[PDB]
Ligand binder design. Sequence first.
Ligand SMILES: O=C1Nc2ccc3ncsc3c2/C1=C/c1cnc[nH]1
Ligand SMILES: [Cl-]
Length: 289
Amino acid sequence: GLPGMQNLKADPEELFTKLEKIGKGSFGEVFKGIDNRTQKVVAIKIIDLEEAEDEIEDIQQEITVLSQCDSPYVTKYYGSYLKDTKLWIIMEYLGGGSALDLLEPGPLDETQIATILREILKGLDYLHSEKKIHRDIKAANVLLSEHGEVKLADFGVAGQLTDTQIKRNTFVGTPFWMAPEVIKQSAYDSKADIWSLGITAIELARGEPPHSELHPMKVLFLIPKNNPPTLEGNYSKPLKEFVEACLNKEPSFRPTAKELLKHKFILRNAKKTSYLTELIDRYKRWKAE
Ligand SMILES: O=C1Nc2ccc3ncsc3c2/C1=C/c1cnc[nH]1
Ligand SMILES: [Cl-]
């Protein structure tokens, strides 16, 4: 069973107007689309199932996790369709672009960094309260609405904790952002997301994560072996300490998302999310040259 699977009689090529590519998930490309009945814009991920084995259980896990989330901070899932051998996965469209996109015109200021981190933390707090772990937190997977709302996306490797399985040990994520215990495949939980958040904070401040210049295979030993990264450069002490709190090699020494929502860097610098429209406008003006 696949949650939200629609009548196999329904034709997604009829119900949706498929537009340009806007991204990609674990296996499928993601397209902007129009719901032909409502004219709302949606995001459509298309996976070829014929061209796919081992992938399908990963796809089912993703959609299962997504369908169980109901949060302003997590991309909505609307349902799935089959067209011949292709699965059409219909999801919330966010027109502002990813936080990573919004870095292309130039650096963020610390108000913007704190606001985006605060909203990410609201998303993580929600997930972790549901015993879910995202496991691929990075600026590319943090999306903005055209109104500046901030949401977590791409649940391609998201995981579920249960009372019979308190921790996980699967090697998943994007290497530069992965926690040391995940890389070493030790038992881990939501604290792994908190490490990835720290890397993302560096990414938001500097434009790239630590080790970004190296072959990803090198971080397989570097991250477990080296002292954790710190934020280097002219940034406020609270931001540097926010980063340090997240990036501790010992997971139990990392704060919870709930706790980080009250961190002085967040409280002193975060502002209304509507202000992030300036960042979205900046990216639009820049794109247009
Ligand atoms: O709107 C979007 N909704 C999504 C849902 C899942 C997803 N998984 C990978 S991307 C992506 C997107 C997505 C990308 C985007 C890029 N610019 C504007 N929107
Ligand atoms: Cl939007």
